[PDB]
Amino acid sequence: PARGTLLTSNFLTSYTRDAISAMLASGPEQAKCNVRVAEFTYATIGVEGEPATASGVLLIPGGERCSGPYPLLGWGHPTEALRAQEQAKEIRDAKGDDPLVTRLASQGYVVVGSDYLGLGKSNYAYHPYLHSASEASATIDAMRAARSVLQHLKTPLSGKVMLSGYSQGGHTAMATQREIEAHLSKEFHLVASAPISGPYALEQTFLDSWSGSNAVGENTFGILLGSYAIVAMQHTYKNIYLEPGQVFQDPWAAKVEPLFPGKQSLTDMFLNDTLPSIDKVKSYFQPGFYSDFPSNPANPFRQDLARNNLLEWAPQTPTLLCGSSNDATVPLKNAQTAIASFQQRGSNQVALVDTGTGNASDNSAFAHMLTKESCIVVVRDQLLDKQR
């Protein structure tokens, strides 16, 4: 089947604008649109270009005071370690109380997000965590399938397309932006891109926080995120190890691969200390690997990270990188580094916005989860709204 072919689809539920405004008051801006929640599966490609399937979520706004046409916003979700997790069902289970619904779809934005290869109803054997090409291919094809759904429902689209995403989703959003701008500008009239708290300077991000802490603070969840990265990069490039023991010490070597993705969420793992805390990193990674990474640019894992940097290009679309200076998980430095190379490449289309407190006393790995909704609102108001 051609990339983007819609395989299955169906509505899960719907929320009235009043019901959405109630959520907002409870959590005050008012919703303007009702939000229909749909799910779907489509045909796409694997990391080698081979056929694969993936699932996705589609939020459709509607209502008397919300006539179209609507802009199409592609969305990249954050790091997901639970293999069976489906965004659409999560929103439905959350009773529609999700920023995608309360902050975007309720304001007239059609939202489409892929669960990514290896997650949700995807048939991929693993998830290519932080792999630019497949994060982009999965998102692009999700938007393709969603358009088929929308065309069948006669949903009026303006034709304008936009991108956004949080955490790993910020990486996804930017990777998609780059791919569309380089090859699909006709098919996708991209008018705005707003990556949120993403590791655009991927390799730099891991190097800067390799010891366990960075200029901002302690990268508390780094062992979980780095382990997911190592395992995923191994599945994709198969150049890191023959078996887990070359990188991880026992007893984790034999448990790490089934975890990413697996039966546990990142939160489960952190709370039950499935993996050691950053203070015991030297007891976690093998000594050879741990010292080779920061001292050898040819290190296999480091090369795989570099291959997924999103720095060497010139963005053409008005871009708003959002994050917080308090964020110690994904330093806002990522945005600065990105912007510096973009300009150095002739592009002045990318701006940066900080939602931090300004008090280094608020610096924490935990500030990362706060940028999701804070940045969705800011990015919507300062850029998306302007470009629709």
Ligand X SMILES: CCCCCCCCO[C@@H]1O[C@H](CO)[C@@H](O)[C@H](O)[C@H]1O
Which residues of the shown chain bind ligand X in the complex (CB under 6 A)? 79, 167-168, 171, 199, 205-206, 209-210, 212, 219, 221-223, 225-226, 266-267, 270, 278, 281, 329-330, 366, 368-369
Give 183 or 263: the residue with its C-beta nearer to ligand X.
263
Give 16 or 277: the residue with its C-beta nearer to ligand X.
277
What's the closest the beta carbon of residue 364 comes to ligand X, in angstroms? Answer: 10
Cα–Cα distance, 240 to 252 (Å, whole number): 16
Give 79 or 363: the residue with its C-beta nearer to ligand X.
79
Asked if omega into 195 is within 30° of 0 (cis), the reply is no
Asked if omega into 287 is within 30° of 0 (cis), the reply is no
What's the closest the beta carbon of residue 348 comes to ligand X, in angstroms? Answer: 26
The pairs formed by 151-159 with CB atoms below 8 angstroms and a separation of 24 or more are 153/60, 155/60, 155/68, 155/70, 155/110, 156/67, 156/68, 156/69, 156/70, 157/68, 157/69, 157/70, 157/71, 157/72, 157/110, 158/68, 158/69, 158/70, 158/71, 158/388, 159/69, 159/189
What's the closest the beta carbon of residue 316 comes to ligand X, in angstroms? Answer: 24
Radius of gyration (C-alpha) of the chain in whole angstroms: 20
Helix ranges (H only) for 44-120 are 87-93, 99
What's the closest the beta carbon of residue 314 comes to ligand X, in angstroms? Answer: 23
Q: Report the residue count for the chain.
A: 388
Give 185 or 267: the residue with its C-beta nearer to ligand X.
267
Residue with tokens 């190097």: 207
Residue 230 tokens read as 């190592």
Give 42 or 200: the residue with its C-beta nearer to ligand X.
200
Amino acid identity, residue 136?
A
What's the closest the beta carbon of residue 63 comes to ligand X, in angstroms? Answer: 28
What's the closest the beta carbon of residue 168 comes to ligand X, in angstroms? Answer: 4
CA 57 distance to own-chain centroid: 14
Residues near 177 by beta carbon (within 8 Å), at least 6 away in sequence? 163, 190, 193, 195, 315, 317, 319
What's the closest the beta carbon of residue 189 comes to ligand X, in angstroms? Answer: 28
What's the closest the beta carbon of residue 173 comes to ligand X, in angstroms? Answer: 12
- CB atoms under 10 Å from CB of 48, counted, come to 8
Cα–Cα distance, 120 to 24 (Å, whole number): 28
Give 70 or 221: the residue with its C-beta nearer to ligand X.
221
Give 226 or 300: the residue with its C-beta nearer to ligand X.
226
Give 42 or 206: the residue with its C-beta nearer to ligand X.
206
